Amino acid sequence: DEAGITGTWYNQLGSTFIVTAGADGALTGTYESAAGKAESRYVLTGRYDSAPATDGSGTALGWTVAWKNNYRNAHSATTWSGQYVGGAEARINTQWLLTSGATEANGWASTLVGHDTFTKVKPS
Amino acid sequence: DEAGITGTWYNQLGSTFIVTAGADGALTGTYESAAGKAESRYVLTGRYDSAPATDGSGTALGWTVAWKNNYRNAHSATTWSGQYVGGAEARINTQWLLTSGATEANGWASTLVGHDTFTKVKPS
Amino acid sequence: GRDEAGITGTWYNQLGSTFIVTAGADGALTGTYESAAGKAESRYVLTGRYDSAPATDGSGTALGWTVAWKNNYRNAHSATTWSGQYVGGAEARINTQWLLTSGATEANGWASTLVGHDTFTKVK
Amino acid sequence: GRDEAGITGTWYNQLGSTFIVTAGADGALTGTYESAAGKAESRYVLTGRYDSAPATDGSGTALGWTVAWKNNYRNAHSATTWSGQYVGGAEARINTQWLLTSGATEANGWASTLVGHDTFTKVK
Ligand SMILES: O=C(CCCC[C@@H]1SC[C@@H]2NC(=O)N[C@@H]21)NC1CCN(c2ccncc2)CC1
Ligand SMILES: O=C(CCCC[C@@H]1SC[C@@H]2NC(=O)N[C@@H]21)NC1CCN(c2ccncc2)CC1
Ligand SMILES: O=C(CCCC[C@@H]1SC[C@@H]2NC(=O)N[C@@H]21)NC1CCN(c2ccncc2)CC1
Ligand SMILES: O=C(CCCC[C@@H]1SC[C@@H]2NC(=O)N[C@@H]21)NC1CCN(c2ccncc2)CC1
């Protein structure tokens, strides 16, 4: 899935996720979000199962973005946890957690949760 | 929080999270889980807000473990999303998502969710 | 504007489960749930709540409900809660995320909760 | 063993919110919820469900409930569902994770859900 996972992906929001799957199970690349307090590209890193089952299961993976770059800092980080599914129209199916820095009076409301699905089709 | 975040942490399960905060916002290190289909250490990587607010807020961060090493492969990955809180007894407060590789008939049940709190106190 | 009639009826989700719901005048949700997935058979009681006076700005209507997976046929020692919102219009949807908690011992509690997302559409 | 009396009563959580619940003989949960956090004032109706015949192996009792954040004082256009389990014994607890969904437009829907975890303990 190295060849499969590596590429430019787009989620249902129009966000762009450019990723490289390393030989050692590493994930690196960039994330540009179409939503929220975000501007231009952000660094990401993660990990994926570099030896998945050969039974029709997807390939487990996850990656993190801390929303700081040279343009903006949203004092937050998102983690996507999901799996890659290969074939004709390959998909990456994820759920995510977005934690913002918070005070102890704020902490109960510090984490947003959602789900993103990624394909390699360039939106229009 | 570079000096603060870097260290050996332990969660409520007795798991060991050894991490280094890089200068560029990188997180690296190892994770050994006291629970589940896991054995000895796993590679992790993530990101943290390397320039947090100076207002009493925590430092947003996240990191990923793919549960494959040279001992075992659980065909799953966990992402922890949370924040670091410094001071006398520093804590890392997280929520997490654990996705396993799944078939399309299995996918509805592929993701576990929980919360881990980390301190630098060595259990007994 | 209030969505008593928009919400009340029969819905299916993407697994083929059947959600039969009545939205009461006072914010109550009642009905039955038949799951096409998991350790479930036939219909289960559900109860929930919805915002009986939503904003007029085009926002959806917040709601939630619970199924405990015990009926006269089977008992899966677990409960799901769906949290999400009703969105009216030509193709109405109920968009949800859910938490499915199983009875667990202390040793198994870390793995006691599944998380997912279901979209419901209404049928005549 | 069934926990009608174990669950029924007044509980507080770690924010200082007050959860007043009656577990009915047929699996129903009813009561009120007063939150010490957020856009909330005084008591809100809740309804939920619990496993009325849990396993006898030491596992807790699965349950869930919903609050919609409209009462006679305030309407926060949102609903929380708590999913978790009751654990009896000398220090009984209700351990939950929760999803809090707010009414959202299509532009804001990606940010419409908060996630967290509450532990409840019972008071005389
Ligand atoms: O907007 C961002 C950074 C952009 C995240 C974009 C998200 S990532 C998941 C989804 N998928 C995408 O592709 N794009 C979106 N961060 C906010 C979070 C909420 N914030 C607070 C404020 C106060 N308290 C709590 C939280 C303020 C900062
Ligand atoms: O046990 C692991 C790997 C160890 C994860 C340990 C977890 S990480 C969050 C928590 N915090 C820790 O410190 N430790 C625990 N993975 C399972 C997941 C559930 N599995 C399935 C099987 C079939 N369908 C769906 C899921 C099988 C593989
Ligand atoms: O299968 C069911 C009951 C049917 C749930 C149906 C689910 S509701 C959300 C989704 N939307 C639907 O329409 N259908 C599915 N319960 C299992 C869950 C797995 N179980 C454990 C045990 C321990 N740890 C983790 C999980 C034990 C029992
Ligand atoms: O504050 C409340 C109602 C009070 C909820 C109390 C919560 S229940 C879970 C936790 N346990 C408790 O005991 N107390 C707290 N609702 C807000 C939430 C933030 N809101 C948005 C809007 C858009 N996107 C995301 C969030 C708008 C309205």
Author numbering:
A (entry chain A), B (entry chain A): 13 to 136
C (entry chain B), D (entry chain B): 11 to 134
Article, verbatim:
We describe here the use of an artificial cofactor employing the well‐known biotin‐streptavidin system to catalyze a Baylis‐Hillman reaction. As protein host, we chose streptavidin, as it can be easily crystallized and thereby supports the design process. There are several examples using streptavidin as the host for these cofactors, since its natural ligand biotin binds strongly (K d∼10−15 M) and is easy to modify with catalysts at the carboxylic acid group. No enzyme is known to naturally catalyze the Baylis‐Hillman reaction, a very versatile and atom‐economic C−C bond forming reaction for the production of various functionalized compounds and intermediates of active pharmaceutical ingredients (APIs).
We chose a derivative of DMAP as the artificial cofactor due to its low steric demand, which will facilitate its inclusion into the protein scaffold. The protein host around the cofactor was rationally designed on the basis of high‐resolution crystal structures obtained after each variation of the amino acid sequence. The location of the catalyst is in a shallow cavity at the surface of the protein. The system was evolved through repeated cycles of mutagenesis, activity tests, and structure determination. According to the presented structures and calculations the catalytically active site is too shallow to undergo interactions with 1.
